[PDB]
């Protein structure tokens, strides 16, 4: 009964703290924003980082990111091989293409912000989250007797 | 002697005295009161309830939280020792906070 067309195991999403949206013949995985926070907001003017992996299965594709929270700047080759992938961000844990954001509008962890990823053949909106990686818990000041 | 009126106003809120069943630990006691979502971390003698941030819980997690005011805190003295016990023994106090995958 549990091994029919609808299965509880085959539809399970990976627990990765990121989105796995698709595009034109391109699959984007683990799309997240690095923005180490200190207060309720990350103020405009600060630069933040965009991280993901782009995969296709058979020979090249170009790409460009646009968004509404400031401007996105790319640095690198920014093309995909036949049976390979394009890694942009190096999330904490890995032992060169970089996506930087100027962030005209303030951001906060917990909400989703729309990003547009455009290729030479396909383009999608993603609505990415913010993820903190191997950063330890930040200290909270002690209370009093009350 | 063992007959009591259950719909008797005994609980002070931001709107006067109210019955027990209409209230819980999350009911504001005055207008604009800040109630924090706290978590149970340590020992009774080590500030059993502490504050929490949206960054602490990730996608596909769940945490149990309790209503904590700045007016309690630590539980070092005997005055805040009976105030941190009422929070943990409240019938309608605990809340589950979940984060949904984007």
């Amino acid at each position: 009964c549990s091994a029919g067309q609808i299965s509880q195991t085959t539809t399970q999403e990976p627990a990765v703290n990121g989105v796995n949206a698709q595009a034109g013949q391109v699959s984007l995985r683990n799309v997240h924003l690095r923005a180490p926070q200190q207060t309720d907001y990350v103020e405009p003017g600060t630069t933040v980082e965009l991280l993901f992996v782009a995969a296709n299965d058979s020979s090249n594709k170009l790409k460009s990111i646009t968004s509404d929270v400031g401007e996105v700047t790319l640095t690198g080759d920014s093309t995909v091989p036949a049976d390979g992938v394009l890694i942009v961000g190096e999330p904490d844990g890995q032992i060169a293409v970089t996506a930087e954001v100027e962030l005209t509008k303030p951001i906060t962890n917990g909400l989703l912000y729309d990003f547009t990823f455009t290729f030479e053949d396909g383009e999608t909106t993603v609505a990415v989250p913010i993820s903190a990686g191997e950063q330890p818990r930040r200290p909270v000041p002690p209370a009093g007797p009350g | 002697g063992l007959i009591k009126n259950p719909w008797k106003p005994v609980v002070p809120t931001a709107e006067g005295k109210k019955a027990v069943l209409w209230t819980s630990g999350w009911t504001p006691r005055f207008k604009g009161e800040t109630i924090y979502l706290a978590r149970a971390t340590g020992r009774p003698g080590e500030s059993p309830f502490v504050k929490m941030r949206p960054e602490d819980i990730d996608a596909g997690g769940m945490e149990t939280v309790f209503p904590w005011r700045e007016s309690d805190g630590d539980g070092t003295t005997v005055e805040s020792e009976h105030k941190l016990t009422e929070i943990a023994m409240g019938v309608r106090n605990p809340v589950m906070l979940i984060r949904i995958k984007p």
Binding site: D40, L111 | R29, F30, K31, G32, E33, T34
Partner: peptide, 26 residues
């Protein structure tokens, strides 16, 4: 019977505002 006051909606809904908090008991 179905419970009255338990209905689904199609309203978008806005992001909550930042909490300020009135200082002291009124």
């Amino acid at each position: 019977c179905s419970p009255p006051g338990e209905t689904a909606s199609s309203e978008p809904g806005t992001t909550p505002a930042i909490w300020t908090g009135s200082p002291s008991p009124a």
